[PDB]
Symmetry: D2
Subunit: 124 residues, 4 copies
Amino acid sequence: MISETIRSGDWKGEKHVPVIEYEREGELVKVKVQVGKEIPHPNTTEHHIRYIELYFLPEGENFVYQVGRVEFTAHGESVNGPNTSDVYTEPIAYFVLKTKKKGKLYALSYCNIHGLWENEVTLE
Amino acid sequence: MISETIRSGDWKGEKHVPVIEYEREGELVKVKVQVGKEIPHPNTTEHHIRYIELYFLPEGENFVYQVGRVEFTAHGESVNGPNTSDVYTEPIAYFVLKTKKKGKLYALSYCNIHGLWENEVTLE
Amino acid sequence: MISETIRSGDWKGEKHVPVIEYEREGELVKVKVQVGKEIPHPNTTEHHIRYIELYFLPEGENFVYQVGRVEFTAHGESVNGPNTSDVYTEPIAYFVLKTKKKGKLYALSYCNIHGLWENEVTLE
Amino acid sequence: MISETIRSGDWKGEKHVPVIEYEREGELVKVKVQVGKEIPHPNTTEHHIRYIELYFLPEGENFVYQVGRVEFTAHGESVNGPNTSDVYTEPIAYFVLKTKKKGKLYALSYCNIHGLWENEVTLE
Ligand SMILES: [Fe+3]
Ligand SMILES: [Fe+3]
Ligand SMILES: [Fe+3]
Ligand SMILES: [Fe+3]
């Protein structure tokens, strides 16, 4: 099972667990997901967070919906060598979801050398 | 040339042109891109905005860097038919870029039935 | 845990399970992944396979690597209505991996209305 | 205009140009796209091809359709340093398109340090 490759708890020293925060404004749900809130995770050409995906399983339903996916594609690479571009995309994802349902939000994160990471929160 | 398929000007009645706004906070550049700010573009199972991509060409350089890509993946589809899930991802993209450079920001947008759309702004 | 939303099963009985096949040619590993090999899966504007992702966990290592991702983006939509374009992308993915390692290959599939599906095979 | 950042050229002389080949089998169109067919392109942690996208503009129509997107995500990175994993995804993309239409096929390629590249062929 692929779940055997997904981690949900950080080790001390490096933050990989996606942190999910959301605000409900009417039928609009603004979701912020980020890796390394307190202690930033490295963002270099050889070690960086590649993307964050958000899923939503509505209360009482059987199928999860992928809500969105954000790819962080610049990590300092340039013709002048690794970490020389001065262009870096930080692992902060924002999603605006339109729904009146409640349920579970799941975030999936991938570090290029540290595998898959997950987290979830209850959408009320 | 693929540019022959990309549009940069809306026709009256439907907004496709990605609108780019940004705020510079130190070395952090917070970029917001959205389709249909004033008049929302439809978001249905048969007609919706699929994604928004952001590119950055630094001043005086020769190669553009893709900064990020955001996919809006929920458009009301469910086992109960099109437009029945009550789960929709709005075409609003937020990117946090770390750079001290200046240059040109380009946004690329795709409507599932109306092709590719582009816009650009100067990052100062 | 997100694994609670991922389904698996026999591909000879469940049309959603990604079927993984591979051929090793020197240091090159040609991997073919497909949904609906036995029982074809629908490909319509309202119901279709969105993408297939391939992961590789080398023997004896602790972190899985995402090998590739393929998005199937055309499902008949057009200005003339759903299922009118006559352009459909079939859920068949090919990956050419360069490695001498052995381990486990995992495939992850997403149906727009039937959630996430997984499968895995041993890479010899 | 974004086209000012996209390059094209002869694939027999420029290693970045995506080479498009296809075979029509009934209503099925098997498309193979690859970068570095003539002159291999590097695939290292600091310099590699990130993805290949395929578009199709049917004859006589006004809107291009994105047919598919393939991301090559492994480029040797590991906890042991750049280029140490022995896992590399080669920039070879395959797409199986179902259509009876004719038109133009466009491929878009991105090198992490050499920007965007394009190519096109006529689908008969
Ligand atoms: Fe890490
Ligand atoms: Fe539209
Ligand atoms: Fe299905
Ligand atoms: Fe290059």
